[PDB]
Amino acid sequence: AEDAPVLSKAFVDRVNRLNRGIWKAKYDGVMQNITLREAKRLNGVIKSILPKRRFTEEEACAPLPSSFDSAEAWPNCPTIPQIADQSACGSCWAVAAASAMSDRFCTMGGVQDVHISAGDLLACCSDCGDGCNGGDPDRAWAYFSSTGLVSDYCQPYPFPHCSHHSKSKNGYPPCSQFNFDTPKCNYTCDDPCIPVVNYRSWTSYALQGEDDYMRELFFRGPFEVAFDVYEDFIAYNSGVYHHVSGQYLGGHAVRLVGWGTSNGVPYWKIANSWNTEWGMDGYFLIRRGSSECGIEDGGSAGIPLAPN
Ligand SMILES: *[C@@H]1O[C@H](CO)[C@@H](O[C@@H]2O[C@H](CO)[C@@H](O[C@@H]3O[C@H](CO)[C@@H](O)[C@H](O)[C@@H]3O)[C@H](O)[C@H]2NC(C)=O)[C@H](O)[C@H]1NC(C)=O
Ligand SMILES: *[C@@H]1O[C@H](CO)[C@@H](O[C@@H]2O[C@H](CO)[C@@H](O)[C@H](O)[C@H]2NC(C)=O)[C@H](O)[C@H]1NC(C)=O
């Protein structure tokens, strides 16, 4: 909608006061100068077509910890702790997915480093939605079930690291400088000196509610969840976020990579698709058990098929 910045030092300070210092919102953070229309852009979930997840007796009848990081359960999967930068697209839906299919190619797919192309997914699945006007996580995985994607070595994400700071530590351009339409769906690799490689799942499925999220994350590794972003979420800097103030900005897809307890507050460690500048080194914590902003509502995962 408006060119109205989303963060006001009244707003942030009211939010900070409301949240009961459980999580520090921040005014002069990395999103301070953000536009209503920009922030809505970032949240690209629009619109089950996947079968619901069946736990084997022993999956369901097992003892999940009360902390868990995928990075640490899988020290040898470099894909996990890497943080993506969707950029100035409503591409989170695709970026969220590819990030986890990369990770699952390691956790199960017997391929250490392979970054699945959010490029490929974001352009070529017209089933999923309309590139950078947003799409459906469910579909993303159904396409990796049906069609399959190429790696980011083949169709590297076509939008650079842009920043939402004046001065940037990691010396990025501003995101207020760009705004990107769906890219050309290509059928060979960007470089022609590189061959195409199909990567697919032999089964995608869907998840629901606190528990299923923890079993699925544990056994099979990070996967893709969405929640409703509220203005307040933009100012987030530390601690376990929960919606206290601000208008709804759309549905935003993120990679669930952990859970844990902080001074008696249940949380989900999550990998946010906006740079490593935003939140806590690119990640955020969100309240868990409340299904806060509906995080525990819709979850999308799959088992990467090991090639040849
Ligand atoms: C499919 O292939 C093409 C590459 O042939 C990709 O579209 C191209 O995206 C590149 C960046 O990845 C664009 O470069 C840009 O050019 C404009 C100048 O007009 C400039 O403003 C930007 O700073 C940047 O240098 C290129 O123009 C664009 N070309 C076409 C034909 O779309 C596309 O992103 C690829 N899709 C996937 C899924 O990787
Ligand atoms: C938010 O907006 C303004 C842009 O008008 C930024 O203010 C200037 O930033 C430069 C360096 O980046 C400083 O040298 C000046 O002191 C600032 N004031 C001026 C030019 O009057 C501000 O830094 C922006 N903040 C963020 C975090 O983006």
Side-chain angles (χ1 to χ4, degrees), residues 117-121 123-124 155-159 178 183-186 190:
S117 173
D120 188 7
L121 175 52
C124 294
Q155 281 200 343
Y157 198 56
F159 314 128
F178 307 114
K184 210 275 153 205
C185 168
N186 311 306
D190 281 28

Side-chain angles (χ1 to χ4, degrees), residues 244-269:
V244 290
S245 309
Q247 32 175 171
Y248 162 104
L249 302 210
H252 184 235
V254 289
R255 189 179 48 126
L256 171 66
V257 311
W259 79 79
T261 282
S262 212
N263 288 152
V265 190
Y267 71 78
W268 302 110
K269 212 170 138 184

Side-chain angles (χ1 to χ4, degrees), residues 28-33 164-167:
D28 66 283
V30 255
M31 290 295 219
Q32 156 162 286
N33 285 343
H164 292 107
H165 216 128
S166 270
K167 208 222 149 60

Side-chain angles (χ1 to χ4, degrees), residues 99-175:
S99 293
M101 296 159 184
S102 294
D103 295 320
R104 271 149 175 275
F105 251 115
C106 195
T107 61
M108 317 174 69
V111 191
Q112 190 154 53
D113 200 305
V114 69
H115 299 102
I116 299 307
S117 173
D120 188 7
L121 175 52
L122 175 57
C124 294
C125 180
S126 7
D127 189 56
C128 291
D130 181 61
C132 300
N133 295 298
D136 187 353
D138 270 17
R139 306 268 174 180
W141 295 77
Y143 181 98
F144 185 75
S145 209
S146 73
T147 305
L149 273 1
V150 304
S151 97
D152 94 349
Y153 181 67
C154 174
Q155 281 200 343
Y157 198 56
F159 314 128
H161 304 320
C162 69
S163 146
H164 292 107
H165 216 128
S166 270
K167 208 222 149 60
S168 155
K169 152 156 39 56
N170 325 285
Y172 293 141
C175 302

Side-chain angles (χ1 to χ4, degrees), residues 2-60 62-192 194-308:
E2 300 319 302
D3 284 354
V6 178
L7 295 187
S8 26
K9 225 255 170 190
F11 179 66
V12 159
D13 285 1
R14 156 199 227 273
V15 158
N16 268 310
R17 185 183 86 243
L18 259 22
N19 75 19
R20 322 202 108 286
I22 278 166
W23 67 267
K24 211 213 149 203
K26 175 158 184 163
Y27 182 51
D28 66 283
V30 255
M31 290 295 219
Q32 156 162 286
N33 285 343
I34 193 167
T35 319
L36 184 52
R37 178 204 19 70
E38 288 183 325
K40 289 176 100 163
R41 191 72 177 148
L42 298 182
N43 322 342
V45 175
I46 70 178
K47 100 188 270 43
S48 256
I49 64 157
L50 302 171
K52 201 189 82 261
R53 168 58 148 81
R54 287 196 135 281
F55 291 102
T56 35
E57 282 260 317
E58 310 84 340
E59 262 165 356
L64 313 162
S66 35
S67 299
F68 190 85
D69 185 355
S70 298
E72 290 197 305
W74 292 295
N76 283 130
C77 289
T79 27
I80 306 274
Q82 277 165 123
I83 292 280
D85 206 8
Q86 87 187 42
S87 189
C89 268
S91 41
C92 61
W93 68 275
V95 170
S99 293
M101 296 159 184
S102 294
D103 295 320
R104 271 149 175 275
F105 251 115
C106 195
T107 61
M108 317 174 69
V111 191
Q112 190 154 53
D113 200 305
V114 69
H115 299 102
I116 299 307
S117 173
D120 188 7
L121 175 52
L122 175 57
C124 294
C125 180
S126 7
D127 189 56
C128 291
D130 181 61
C132 300
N133 295 298
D136 187 353
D138 270 17
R139 306 268 174 180
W141 295 77
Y143 181 98
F144 185 75
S145 209
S146 73
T147 305
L149 273 1
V150 304
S151 97
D152 94 349
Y153 181 67
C154 174
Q155 281 200 343
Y157 198 56
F159 314 128
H161 304 320
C162 69
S163 146
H164 292 107
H165 216 128
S166 270
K167 208 222 149 60
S168 155
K169 152 156 39 56
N170 325 285
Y172 293 141
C175 302
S176 50
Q177 190 184 195
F178 307 114
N179 209 45
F180 307 108
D181 269 316
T182 311
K184 210 275 153 205
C185 168
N186 311 306
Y187 297 100
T188 66
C189 297
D190 281 28
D191 195 299
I194 273 198
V196 181
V197 175
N198 207 48
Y199 288 115
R200 93 186 60 103
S201 65
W202 67 265
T203 163
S204 282
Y205 46 69
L207 295 126
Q208 208 128 43
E210 169 150 54
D211 185 273
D212 291 35
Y213 279 30
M214 279 191 294
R215 273 169 209 293
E216 185 51 24
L217 177 66
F218 179 79
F219 283 91
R220 302 214 162 158
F223 60 96
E224 178 185 38
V225 297
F227 68 101
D228 309 336
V229 172
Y230 297 78
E231 284 196 301
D232 62 326
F233 179 79
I234 304 297
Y236 174 99
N237 171 249
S238 35
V240 184
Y241 166 93
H242 79 292
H243 172 43
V244 290
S245 309
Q247 32 175 171
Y248 162 104
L249 302 210
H252 184 235
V254 289
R255 189 179 48 126
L256 171 66
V257 311
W259 79 79
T261 282
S262 212
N263 288 152
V265 190
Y267 71 78
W268 302 110
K269 212 170 138 184
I270 297 209
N272 209 352
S273 337
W274 319 328
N275 213 289
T276 38
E277 274 160 19
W278 179 91
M280 300 169 293
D281 294 356
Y283 303 78
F284 74 85
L285 278 31
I286 176 156
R287 214 169 204 114
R288 158 169 74 84
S290 43
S291 184
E292 184 67 50
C293 315
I295 192 72
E296 300 161 27
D297 298 6
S300 304
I303 311 168
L305 182 42
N308 224 249

